[PDB]
Amino acid sequence: MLYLQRMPTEFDVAMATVYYLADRNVSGETFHPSGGLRYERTPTGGELFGLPSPERLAELVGSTVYLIGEHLTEHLNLLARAYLERYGARQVVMIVETETGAETMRRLLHDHVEAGRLMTIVAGDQIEAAIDQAITRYGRPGPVVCTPFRPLPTVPLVGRKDSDWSTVLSEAEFAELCEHQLTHHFRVARKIALSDGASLALVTPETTATSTTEQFALANFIKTTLHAFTATIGVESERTAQRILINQVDLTRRARAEEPRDPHERQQELERFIEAVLLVTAPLPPEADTRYAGRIHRGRAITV
């Protein structure tokens, strides 16, 4: 791994840290007291992507697909329509936390609910058991897409210089933030990975031009945190010879100027999310699952 074939000791790192701490014009950077390492990387930030191959699309026909979410009612509606009506999916299961969300998703797609193609289960904080029932009484999944349940809070991150910071985001609320936005994805990923899924699309929280600055900050936090988890789990699955393709589809942009401003661009972003999740969820035929193609198609995160 080393260029110099020598690992510096703790004293050298402490020396560099003490020297660097005296700088008075740095904040929010990543300082590396040592480096020069030969290790494989998985760059993120992809945005230029198109439609997947028709052969992968044909694999989606007759598959078992689950959709999970609470806050993205319109997104889940559009995606459920896309899989059922356009690519011959037999059934979709909506895994939700609240009875209100189940009722809402039932009403939005009542036509599919009465047809027996869109069926709802309630998960709460035991989503493993909800997926377990779903598998038991419907069969094992194919491609699955997971989205966050809870929205982003708007409590302040920093208060005024002469303020008491009583209303600022505290330790507890950060704990539920980590639980809902990080632990939920881990739980769903582990459950599907041990349940023989075909592909797994993790959805980052969404932001628009109406989002507040604190929402942008927490969204960037979640994006950067989840990037590493997705990359590591994808590479681990590739080395452990699992069929499953775990990828990330991103609904957030780093600044306000990058987000759309009009409904036309909004529906463009909707269809772009649809095509991105089609890319990351279309099953690859077992004959085409080579070393190089499997290496490319795991651990990748793209931005819509």
Added chain:
Amino acid sequence: QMQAMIQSELAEVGYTDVEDRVHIAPGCDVSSEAQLADLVERTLSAFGTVDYLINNAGIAGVEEMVIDMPVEGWRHTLFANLISNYSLMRKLAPLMKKQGSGYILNVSSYFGGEKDAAIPYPNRADYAVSKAGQRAMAEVFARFLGPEIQIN
């Protein structure tokens, strides 16, 4: 032992009254919020306003496959490596913004990733994700904590 050796070095290098320059607050497990508050109050009583917060405490983790990782280990790793950072940041920020100066330094790791470039690190997903979360916390709170308080 570390305190004794440190104070011996300080006495050797010419400093005076080493016993008032190096205190210890042992027995504080980073996994408990109450122990974090106890550490904060002990440091405040001992030396008053604290300028530098060197958050280095971090364990290896569950040390397993993602597909062999219990959720309780996942929560413990997040609490020890990620949650505690924001907890101590919250408890120590008011003084640093009151006095107009401050610095918090979080000990990350190369094997967690980088901006626009991730790094796989098998058997150790929890450590990598928590470490990148620490890095993200710093990079995103730099704006709001400034210009009074530094984060790195």
Added chain:
Amino acid sequence: QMQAMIQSELAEVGYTDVEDRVHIAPGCDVSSEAQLADLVERTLSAFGTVDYLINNAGIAGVEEMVIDMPVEGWRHTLFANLISNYSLMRKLAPLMKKQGSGYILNVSSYFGGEKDAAIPYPNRADYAVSKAGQRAMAEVFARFLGPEIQINAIAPGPVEGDRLRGTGERPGLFARRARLILENKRLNELHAALIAAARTDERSMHELVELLLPNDVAALEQNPAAPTALRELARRFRSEGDPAASSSSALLNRSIAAKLLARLHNGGYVLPADIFANLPNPPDPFFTRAQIDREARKVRDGIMGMLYLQRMPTEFDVAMATVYYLADRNVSGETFHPSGGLRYERTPTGGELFGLPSPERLAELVGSTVYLIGEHLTEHLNLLARAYLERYGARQVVMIVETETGAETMRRLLHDHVEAGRLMTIVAGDQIEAAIDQAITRYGRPGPVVCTPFRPLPTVPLVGRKDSDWSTVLSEAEFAELCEHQLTHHFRVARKIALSDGASLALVTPETTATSTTEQFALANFIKTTLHAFTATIGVESERTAQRILINQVDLTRRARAEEPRDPHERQQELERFIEAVLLVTAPLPPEADTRYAGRIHRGRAITV
């Protein structure tokens, strides 16, 4: 003066014999190799063996847009900022490797990019590409120069200093940058309107420019025969203009007319030199002071808003941190940032996932004029010519080569289409602009174009034995030839096509396989990393200047030899993937689908195959 103050401080701080601690070498211009050799021999005579090499000498550059960039200025800034780095490193390295230790540090800047993330920096492409070259040089020579020699680069952010000095990152007189920004925007809008008119209107360039001679925006606005582009430009000049400034009523002045004529001439458009001699001169002030003040405050506020800490570090802090860093011994091949926390858009690179382009974009390929350029990559060019002609209905393809032998080889490999009149050949040499000019004049203006390097990758050693004379190591002339063939050629082709109304332009980095040597891999990585910044800068710049052109990069180079094919099946797979990637980056987007967001996505992107 600096030596006197330094030695005064040294005498004050208790040191002895300050006269032997600081020496001066005035008149050593870094742009000349002979002066560099004189500096090397003089410092060797003065203090003997040199341990630390702090290469900081670097100029802002041409300070002009790419389509406004003379070739000689590009060459001069390339010699000044990038070539001299390897020149000094080559001159000094044997001695440091003889003594068993050494350190070289390049003083870069933040505004050129990072690993897998590029940073645009418009109107300053040369500075950015030279910067990326410095970082790539350090990164790739880290492994070879080890373990005896360390190599690193420092890339500080905006640092407060003299307004008249600096490498262009900081203002500075906001007035001058402000006025040049407005003049450039006026020229860019007028040129874009003229190009858009000439794209679809039957009137030649002469008649279209003839509408501009009265210098009356009103006469253009209500002119029924005027193109929609020029009428819309008049409406925008009325909407955004200031009645107190003659520019809201007058189209242009002498300087803008001369620059526009230069752009038109270099773009292959035929116009007399005296066409702008009789243009009426708008009365002063052409620009009101309110506008320049407003957008100068805009630029200053943007620069300040980049800062998280709302204050700019000083030079002393950066130097102090640099010396603190120099005390570290276990680092080599990294980029140090003494200052950061900056607001700027990034263009991440290293993308390797892609599919096939949309069928609507494929239909655009039918009936277009496509040029392919290259010498070494005969098989790839053959496959691409076959793909465009036989599979997507291309009308005619021109193969532009450096020598007669390459033209003959390409003709023989595709004789069937040569005799059919669908594959034609031109010879370029080192006057590629002339080859493009004859191609446009005698066959028409291009659509999508893909460019590949002429020369192969040399296999000369980059590091020699410790007890050797370094006779066979890569020489400075060899490095100059390398950057000329692999970097200057792409710049020249991109400039010429950009001024020539291209539809899209795909830049190809040199190809690497498992058969290549380690030195070839290092040089290919250097070229790829260097070209990433140039591609990102030109893409963002063209997006900002409302250009139709989509300029992108496709990578045939991979960082590790373990990533290269080991069987013919993988080789043909990579060939097909290269075809798909060029198809993605060359397929024209319909004008209806050319939105702000889609245009932003499809410019400045690089895909690794």
